[PDB]
Short mmCIF file of C-alpha atoms and ligand atoms in Angstrom, two decimals:
data_model
loop_
_atom_site.label_atom_id
_atom_site.label_comp_id
_atom_site.label_asym_id
_atom_site.label_seq_id
_atom_site.Cartn_x
_atom_site.Cartn_y
_atom_site.Cartn_z
CA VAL A 1 -20.31 6.81 0.67
CA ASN A 2 -16.89 7.50 2.22
CA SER A 3 -14.67 10.52 2.91
CA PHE A 4 -12.05 9.99 0.18
CA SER A 5 -11.83 13.09 -2.03
CA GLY A 6 -10.35 14.05 -5.39
CA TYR A 7 -9.77 10.52 -6.74
CA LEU A 8 -10.05 9.52 -10.38
CA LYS A 9 -12.21 6.40 -10.81
CA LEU A 10 -10.43 3.72 -12.84
CA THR A 11 -12.86 0.79 -12.43
CA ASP A 12 -15.86 -0.23 -10.36
CA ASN A 13 -13.62 -0.58 -7.28
CA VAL A 14 -10.22 1.09 -7.95
CA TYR A 15 -9.58 4.82 -7.51
CA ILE A 16 -6.32 6.79 -7.90
CA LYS A 17 -4.89 10.18 -6.86
CA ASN A 18 -1.56 12.03 -6.86
CA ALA A 19 -1.04 12.32 -3.11
CA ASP A 20 1.28 11.76 -0.17
CA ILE A 21 -0.11 8.69 1.59
CA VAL A 22 1.00 10.05 4.97
CA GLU A 23 -0.98 13.26 4.50
CA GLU A 24 -3.93 11.35 3.03
CA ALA A 25 -4.09 9.01 6.04
CA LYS A 26 -3.88 11.88 8.52
CA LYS A 27 -6.80 13.61 6.78
CA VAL A 28 -9.10 10.63 6.18
CA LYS A 29 -8.17 8.41 9.15
CA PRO A 30 -9.19 5.35 7.10
CA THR A 31 -10.13 2.02 8.61
CA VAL A 32 -7.08 0.52 6.86
CA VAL A 33 -3.87 2.07 5.52
CA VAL A 34 -1.56 -0.29 3.61
CA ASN A 35 2.18 -0.19 4.29
CA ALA A 36 4.69 -1.26 1.64
CA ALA A 37 6.50 -3.51 4.13
CA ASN A 38 9.46 -5.86 3.99
CA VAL A 39 9.56 -9.28 5.66
CA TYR A 40 11.41 -7.92 8.71
CA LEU A 41 9.04 -4.96 9.19
CA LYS A 42 12.09 -2.67 9.13
CA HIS A 43 10.48 0.62 8.09
CA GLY A 44 13.51 2.47 6.82
CA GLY A 45 12.56 4.19 3.56
CA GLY A 46 9.90 4.64 0.93
CA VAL A 47 6.29 4.53 2.10
CA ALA A 48 7.27 2.46 5.15
CA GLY A 49 9.86 4.93 6.42
CA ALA A 50 7.44 7.80 5.85
CA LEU A 51 4.51 6.14 7.64
CA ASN A 52 6.71 5.12 10.55
CA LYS A 53 8.16 8.63 10.90
CA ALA A 54 4.62 10.03 11.05
CA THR A 55 3.90 7.69 14.02
CA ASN A 56 6.98 9.00 15.88
CA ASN A 57 8.52 5.48 15.58
CA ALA A 58 5.59 3.78 17.38
CA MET A 59 4.99 1.67 14.26
CA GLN A 60 8.58 0.38 14.43
CA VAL A 61 8.35 -0.40 18.17
CA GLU A 62 5.15 -2.39 17.63
CA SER A 63 6.65 -4.12 14.60
CA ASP A 64 9.79 -5.19 16.47
CA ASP A 65 7.63 -6.92 19.09
CA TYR A 66 5.58 -8.58 16.32
CA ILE A 67 8.73 -10.00 14.69
CA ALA A 68 10.21 -11.11 18.01
CA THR A 69 7.04 -13.16 18.63
CA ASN A 70 6.17 -14.40 15.13
CA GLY A 71 9.28 -14.21 12.94
CA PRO A 72 9.43 -12.64 9.48
CA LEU A 73 6.55 -12.39 7.06
CA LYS A 74 6.54 -14.16 3.70
CA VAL A 75 7.07 -12.27 0.47
CA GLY A 76 3.49 -11.90 -0.76
CA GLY A 77 2.15 -12.03 2.80
CA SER A 78 0.80 -9.54 5.29
CA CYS A 79 -0.12 -8.83 8.89
CA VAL A 80 -2.59 -6.44 10.53
CA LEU A 81 -1.16 -4.11 13.18
CA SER A 82 -2.23 -0.80 14.68
CA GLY A 83 -2.72 2.24 12.48
CA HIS A 84 -1.48 4.47 15.35
CA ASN A 85 -2.37 8.13 14.65
CA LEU A 86 -2.88 7.51 10.91
CA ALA A 87 -5.69 4.93 10.63
CA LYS A 88 -7.52 2.35 12.70
CA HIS A 89 -5.35 -0.47 11.32
CA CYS A 90 -2.24 -0.80 9.20
CA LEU A 91 -2.09 -3.75 6.81
CA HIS A 92 1.63 -4.41 6.30
CA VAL A 93 1.92 -6.08 2.87
CA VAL A 94 5.17 -7.43 1.42
CA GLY A 95 5.43 -7.11 -2.33
CA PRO A 96 8.49 -8.53 -4.08
CA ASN A 97 11.53 -6.26 -4.10
CA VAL A 98 13.03 -6.58 -7.59
CA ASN A 99 16.21 -4.95 -6.26
CA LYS A 100 16.57 -8.13 -4.12
CA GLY A 101 15.84 -10.54 -6.99
CA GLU A 102 12.36 -11.54 -5.80
CA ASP A 103 9.77 -13.10 -8.10
CA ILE A 104 7.44 -10.49 -9.62
CA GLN A 105 4.71 -13.15 -9.88
CA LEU A 106 4.37 -12.76 -6.10
CA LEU A 107 2.89 -9.29 -6.69
CA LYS A 108 -0.53 -10.85 -7.35
CA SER A 109 -0.33 -12.80 -4.07
CA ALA A 110 0.57 -9.55 -2.28
CA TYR A 111 -2.48 -7.73 -3.67
CA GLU A 112 -4.77 -10.65 -2.71
CA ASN A 113 -4.31 -9.57 0.93
CA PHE A 114 -6.34 -6.44 0.13
CA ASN A 115 -9.45 -8.61 -0.47
CA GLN A 116 -9.73 -9.28 3.26
CA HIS A 117 -10.69 -5.61 3.83
CA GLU A 118 -13.74 -3.82 2.45
CA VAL A 119 -12.01 -0.43 1.94
CA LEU A 120 -8.31 0.50 1.95
CA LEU A 121 -5.97 3.43 1.36
CA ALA A 122 -2.87 2.01 -0.31
CA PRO A 123 0.27 2.63 -2.36
CA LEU A 124 1.21 0.71 -5.48
CA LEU A 125 2.90 -2.47 -4.27
CA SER A 126 6.50 -3.12 -5.36
CA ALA A 127 6.74 0.37 -6.90
CA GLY A 128 9.27 3.03 -5.92
CA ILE A 129 12.31 1.64 -4.12
CA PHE A 130 11.01 -1.94 -4.52
CA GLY A 131 12.01 -1.56 -8.18
CA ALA A 132 9.02 -2.95 -10.11
CA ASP A 133 7.23 -1.27 -13.03
CA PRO A 134 4.42 0.88 -11.55
CA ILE A 135 2.26 0.49 -14.67
CA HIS A 136 2.46 -3.25 -14.08
CA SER A 137 1.66 -2.81 -10.38
CA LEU A 138 -1.48 -0.81 -11.19
CA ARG A 139 -2.58 -3.46 -13.70
CA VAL A 140 -2.12 -6.28 -11.18
CA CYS A 141 -4.02 -4.24 -8.59
CA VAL A 142 -6.99 -3.70 -10.91
CA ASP A 143 -7.04 -7.37 -11.96
CA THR A 144 -6.66 -8.77 -8.41
CA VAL A 145 -8.30 -6.50 -5.83
CA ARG A 146 -12.10 -6.75 -5.69
CA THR A 147 -12.64 -4.60 -2.59
CA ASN A 148 -12.60 -0.79 -2.69
CA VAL A 149 -9.04 0.52 -2.98
CA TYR A 150 -7.93 4.16 -2.98
CA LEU A 151 -4.43 4.37 -4.47
CA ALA A 152 -2.13 7.26 -3.50
CA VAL A 153 0.68 7.88 -6.02
CA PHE A 154 3.30 10.21 -4.53
CA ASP A 155 5.04 11.32 -7.74
CA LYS A 156 2.88 13.68 -9.81
CA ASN A 157 4.74 12.85 -13.01
CA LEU A 158 4.25 9.11 -12.48
CA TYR A 159 0.57 9.63 -11.70
CA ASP A 160 -0.02 11.33 -15.06
CA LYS A 161 1.68 8.44 -16.88
CA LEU A 162 -0.42 5.84 -15.03
CA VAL A 163 -3.66 7.66 -15.90
CA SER A 164 -2.77 8.39 -19.53
CA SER A 165 -1.56 4.82 -20.08
CA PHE A 166 -4.37 3.10 -18.17
CA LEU A 167 -6.27 0.60 -20.29
O1 LIG N 201 4.94 2.12 -3.25
C1 LIG N 201 5.69 2.82 -4.22
C2 LIG N 201 5.17 4.30 -4.31
N1 LIG N 201 5.53 5.08 -3.09
C3 LIG N 201 4.71 5.97 -2.37
N2 LIG N 201 3.39 6.12 -2.71
C4 LIG N 201 2.58 7.00 -2.01
N3 LIG N 201 2.93 7.78 -0.99
C5 LIG N 201 4.24 7.65 -0.65
N4 LIG N 201 4.88 8.30 0.36
C6 LIG N 201 6.19 7.96 0.44
C7 LIG N 201 6.43 7.02 -0.55
C8 LIG N 201 5.20 6.78 -1.28
C9 LIG N 201 5.75 4.97 -5.59
C10 LIG N 201 5.11 6.26 -6.13
C11 LIG N 201 4.88 4.96 -6.86
CL1 CL N 202 8.95 4.43 -2.63
#
């Protein structure tokens, strides 16, 4: 039993809700919130800009030190950093950005990072400003993640389409 509330159950392990991931994280304080990161951990817009703003830029300061030490992530890769005031940990996961010409096949590799954590609050990877089809992202999530994932979908209209079209 956990403190996630109001989610529709899609499969044994995948749950979904129309919600603002920032407000969800502040309420639940999950062990892990997933950021829709880029390889440079530059949290400018989308989920990343919103999460970073909610930390008063502390996420960006920590991320800049991470990059200075380790260099960029790989597309499809991840790193674990602090969750600041939102969660215990933030798993920064880089899905392919179609608006940069990146290979959509890497979306499965991106979701595999979730399997290293028993329970996560997450967005749909490569959706929104990363330019991939969200119906596809949900399908890859369901077919790749085996741990317990709570998906927050910001746009209410998109949420209804994902539910009604879910196979
Ligand atoms: O990952 C793409 C995804 N974006 C977000 N999901 C949940 N909460 C959010 N807050 C700000 C952006 C954002 C779009 C809706 C499918
Ligand atoms: Cl977005």
